[PDB]
Short mmCIF file of N, CA, C and O in Angstrom, two decimals:
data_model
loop_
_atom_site.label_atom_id
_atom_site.label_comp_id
_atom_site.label_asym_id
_atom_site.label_seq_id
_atom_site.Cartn_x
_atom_site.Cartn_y
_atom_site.Cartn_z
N UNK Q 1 -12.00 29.87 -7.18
CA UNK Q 1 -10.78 29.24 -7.66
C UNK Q 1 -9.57 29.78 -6.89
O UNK Q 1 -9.62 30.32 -5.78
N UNK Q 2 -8.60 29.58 -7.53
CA UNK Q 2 -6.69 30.43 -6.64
C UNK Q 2 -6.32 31.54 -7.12
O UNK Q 2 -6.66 31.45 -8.30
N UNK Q 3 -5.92 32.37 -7.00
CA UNK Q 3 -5.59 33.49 -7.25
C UNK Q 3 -4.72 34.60 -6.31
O UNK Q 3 -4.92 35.43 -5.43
N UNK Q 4 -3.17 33.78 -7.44
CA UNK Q 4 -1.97 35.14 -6.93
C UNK Q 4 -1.21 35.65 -7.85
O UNK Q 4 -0.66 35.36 -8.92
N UNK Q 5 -1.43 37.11 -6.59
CA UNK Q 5 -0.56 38.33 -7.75
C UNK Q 5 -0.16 39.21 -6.05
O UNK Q 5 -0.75 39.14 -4.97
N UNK Q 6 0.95 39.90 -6.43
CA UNK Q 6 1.85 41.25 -5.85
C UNK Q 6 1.71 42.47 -5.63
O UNK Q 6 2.65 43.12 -5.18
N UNK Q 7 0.66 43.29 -0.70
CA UNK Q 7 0.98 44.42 -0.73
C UNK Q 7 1.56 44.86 -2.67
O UNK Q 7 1.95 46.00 -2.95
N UNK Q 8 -0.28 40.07 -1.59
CA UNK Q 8 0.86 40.80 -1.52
C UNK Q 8 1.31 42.25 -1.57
O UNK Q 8 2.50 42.53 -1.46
N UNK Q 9 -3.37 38.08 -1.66
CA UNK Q 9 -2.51 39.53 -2.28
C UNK Q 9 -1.48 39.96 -1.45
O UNK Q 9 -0.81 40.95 -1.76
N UNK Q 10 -6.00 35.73 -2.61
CA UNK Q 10 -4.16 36.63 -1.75
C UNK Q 10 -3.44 37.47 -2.27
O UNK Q 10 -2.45 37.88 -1.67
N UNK Q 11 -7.88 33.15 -2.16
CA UNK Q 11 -7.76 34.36 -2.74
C UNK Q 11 -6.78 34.89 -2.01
O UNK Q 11 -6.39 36.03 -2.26
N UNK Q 12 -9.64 30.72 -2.14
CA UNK Q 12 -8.36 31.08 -1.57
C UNK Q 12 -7.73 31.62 -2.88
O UNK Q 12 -6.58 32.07 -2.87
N UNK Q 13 -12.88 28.68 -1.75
CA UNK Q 13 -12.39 29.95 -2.08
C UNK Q 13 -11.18 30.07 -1.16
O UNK Q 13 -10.49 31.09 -1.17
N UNK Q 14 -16.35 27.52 -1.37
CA UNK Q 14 -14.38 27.31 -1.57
C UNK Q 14 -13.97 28.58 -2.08
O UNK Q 14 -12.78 28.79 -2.32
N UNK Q 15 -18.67 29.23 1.52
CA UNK Q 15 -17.95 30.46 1.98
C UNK Q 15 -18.12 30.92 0.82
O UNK Q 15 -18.20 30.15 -0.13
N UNK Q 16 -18.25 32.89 0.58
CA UNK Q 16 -17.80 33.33 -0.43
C UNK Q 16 -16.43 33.40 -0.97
O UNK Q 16 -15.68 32.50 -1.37
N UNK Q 17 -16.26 35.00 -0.88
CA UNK Q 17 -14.84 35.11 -1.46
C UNK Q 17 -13.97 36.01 -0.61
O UNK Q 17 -14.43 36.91 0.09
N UNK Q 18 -12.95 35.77 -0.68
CA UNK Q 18 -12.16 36.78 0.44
C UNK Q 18 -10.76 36.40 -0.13
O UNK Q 18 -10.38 35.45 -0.80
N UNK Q 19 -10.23 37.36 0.30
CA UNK Q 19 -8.65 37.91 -0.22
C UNK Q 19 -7.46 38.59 0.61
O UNK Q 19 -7.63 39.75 0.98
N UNK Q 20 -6.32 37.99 0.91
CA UNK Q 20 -5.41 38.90 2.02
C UNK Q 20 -3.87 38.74 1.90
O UNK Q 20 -3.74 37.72 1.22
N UNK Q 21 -2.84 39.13 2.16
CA UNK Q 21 -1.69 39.00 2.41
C UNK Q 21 -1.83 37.82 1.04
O UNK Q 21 -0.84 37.19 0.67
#
């Protein structure tokens, strides 16, 4: 699914899963 939260991370995935900036 989407997923944001705050060095901000982000994961967007839908591939596994991965997460960045």
């Amino acid at each position: 699914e989407r997923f944001y939260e705050k060095x901000v991370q982000k994961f967007i995935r839908v591939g596994v899963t991965i997460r960045e900036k």
